[PDB]
Amino acid sequence: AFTVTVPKDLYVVEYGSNMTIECKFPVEKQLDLAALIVYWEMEDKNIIQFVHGEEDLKVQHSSYRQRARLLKDQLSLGNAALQITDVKLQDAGVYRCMISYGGADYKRITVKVNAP
Amino acid sequence: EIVLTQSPATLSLSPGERATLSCRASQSVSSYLAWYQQKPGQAPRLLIYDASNRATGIPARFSGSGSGTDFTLTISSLEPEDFAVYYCQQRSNWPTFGQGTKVEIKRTVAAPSVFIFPPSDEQLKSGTASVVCLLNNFYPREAKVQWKVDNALQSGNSQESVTEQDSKDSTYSLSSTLTLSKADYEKHKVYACEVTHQGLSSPVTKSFNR
Amino acid sequence: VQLVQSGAEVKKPGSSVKVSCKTSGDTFSTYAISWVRQAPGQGLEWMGGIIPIFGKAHYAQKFQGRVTITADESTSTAYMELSSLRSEDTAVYFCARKFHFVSGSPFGMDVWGQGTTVTVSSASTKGPSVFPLAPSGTAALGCLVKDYFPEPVTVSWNSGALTSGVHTFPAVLQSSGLYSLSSVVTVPSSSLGTQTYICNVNHKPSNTKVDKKVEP
């Protein structure tokens, strides 16, 4: 069935560095961008909400101001990845990635930041 | 919102003739578009998807095409079961529909058979009088029905009703109702209704003397 | 894949309504379902939609406030709740699902529910009064179905026997907030003295069954 997959379910990053969390979803020939929906939610935050090729920033949590970004060019490959720049200690925690292209599925990624 | 403008509003044709329904979009929807056929009392049914692709179970007489802002649905030979409104839907963003295009069966002109019904005794002892004028088995739908009481053109107080095209002979029918009070009714005598149609080469007047 | 909605409802202004929709088809939790309002003599309107596992709905900016869309994955049932009912909220409300092959937006509508009719009015439930119409080679007969709420009213002439030549006109809503209607049959003149003409009226909402003999 439709299944979202993560290459790494645990990331160890360290402070003040730019990190990327990868999420892979099935794409066959050409990506139909209209059909694509991408949610990056860590816990009760919302990081990225992506529908019809637009980001709704009204629902993004303020912790992520001009910090988090979804990499677009990887999407055509069936890779929807989130890039948090300048990772702080509070960025450690469980991230969820929900995708709908055709069907829909989600996944969980735990991120540990280690201290200087 | 992307806005879909369907044209024309009302397409009137007859069996065997081709039909052409247009839809334009206020922006580029690319090829994401779908046509639907809604008969009265029913939910829409997908005809053409991805703007050129016909759904299976749907007759080969149906076709659609276009990309970007301009689309057309075409019915090769109109089947009696093809007459209904036709909507359209764009999926390139949050789905928006059009106004829909209603296809009417076109036939030869038919003059209405006009009748008139006085408020029968039943209603009158409730203190209400409804005088009814009927137009029957006429085409096209356009008709002009005037009320006049003792030769006074009656002003804006009547309720019209038009039936849908008949299942068999494709004719309309119209019922205009004038509702007065038994008091208001009893103070006059001559009650008439003047009907205007195309098949009628002179306005017909049905009446009765109260 | 199939969709089935809840029955029709009459709600008085300012109250609230919740419409049910169940998927007998493909996966429920995986694919988006949408809710669509078709106003009387109007176009279809996308209200909102939700993909149940996501657990939060998306709404059109017009319906942003009053509409609440919730998906129960347990039952594979979807709900649409309309708060603060008014007047022109009266419409035919649909729930719909996309075919997996039509592409475009996940909220595209292809498979539809049979529809839910919602009426918003202050008027109470009242059966019709029925009045005959004095007949007119070719005569015309009929009955006035007057002052009934709510819709619909079915009209059958001789216990359903007559059929041919009969017209029941669409209901017309009076200023009173009560509906009125007229049914007419065209029969040959000679048939008046011979064949009996009676008119059966049925009001399901009020459980009113009326019969009216129509005579010269």
Author numbering:
A (entry chain A): 18 to 133
B (entry chain L): 1 to 210
C (entry chain H): 2 to 137, 144 to 223
Paper text:
As the exact epitope and mechanism are crucial elements for antibody drugs, we report the crystal structures of checkpoint molecules in complex with the Fab fragments of therapeutic antibodies approved by the FDA or currently undergoing clinical trials, and reveal the binding modes of the complexes and the conformational changes induced by the antibody binding, thereby providing a structural basis of checkpoint blockade by monoclonal antibodies for the treatment of cancer. In summary, the elucidation of the crystal structures of the checkpoint molecules PD-1, PD-L1 and CTLA-4 in complex with the Fab fragments of therapeutic antibodies sheds light on the molecular mechanisms underlying the therapeutic activity of these monoclonal antibodies. Blockade of the ligand-receptor interaction of these immune checkpoint molecules can directly enhance the function of T-cells, which represents a critical paradigm shift whereby checkpoint blockade aims at disinhibition of the activity of T-cells compared with the previous immuno-oncology concept, whereby cancer vaccines and cytokine therapies aimed at de novo activation of immune responses. Monoclonal antibodies blocking immune checkpoints have demonstrated unprecedented therapeutic benefits in clinical trials and provided a major breakthrough in oncology.
